[PDB]
Amino acid sequence: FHVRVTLPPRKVVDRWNEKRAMFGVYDNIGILGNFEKHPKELIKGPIWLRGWKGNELQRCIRKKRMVGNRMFIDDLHNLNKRISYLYKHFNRHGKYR
Amino acid sequence: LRSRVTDRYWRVQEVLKHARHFRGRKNRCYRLAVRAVTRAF
C-alpha cells in the first residue's frame, strides 16, 4: 500500500490552448447553417462508428458488416468469437429474462 | 480509463490504530486486525 514519496511535477494545463478554446464551435452548423450539414459530419472517428451508437453486440455486429472484409485474420476471427459469445450471453443469460 | 485505489494506506490505518494495543499478530495484520477491532467495538 506504499504511497509515492515525492510530489509529482505539478502539471499545468492552460485552458486557453487552441483545441480547448475552439471546442464545440460548429455544433450548431445545422440550425444556424440553413440545414445542409447535420452535426454528424463533424464526428472524427472509426468508419463504422460515425454518428451512430449501440450496445457491445450491436457495435461488433456492425463493425463486421462494414469493415469485416478489410480485417486481419486474427482480428476477424476474434470478432466472430466475440459476436457469438455476446449473442449467447445476451439472449440466454441474465436475471430478468 | 483504469482506476486504482491510491489511498488504500489510510483506509488501513483507520482500522489499525484501534488495534495497536492488542497482543499477537492481531495488532499488525489487516485481516486479523479488522476482525479483532470489530469484536472490540
Binding site: V3, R4, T6, P8 | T6, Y9
Partner: peptide, 26 residues
C-alpha cells in the same frame, strides 16, 4: 506508478509528522 497528486500530497503530510516526532523542534 499511480497517477494523481492527491495521495502524494497527503503523504507529504505524514512525512512531516514523522519528521516532527523523531526530532522535536525547540
Amino acid at each position: 506508478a499511480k497517477k494523481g497528486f492527491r495521495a502524494a500530497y497527503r503523504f507529504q503530510k505524514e512525512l512531516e509528522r514523522w519528521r516532527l516526532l523523531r526530532c522535536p523542534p525547540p
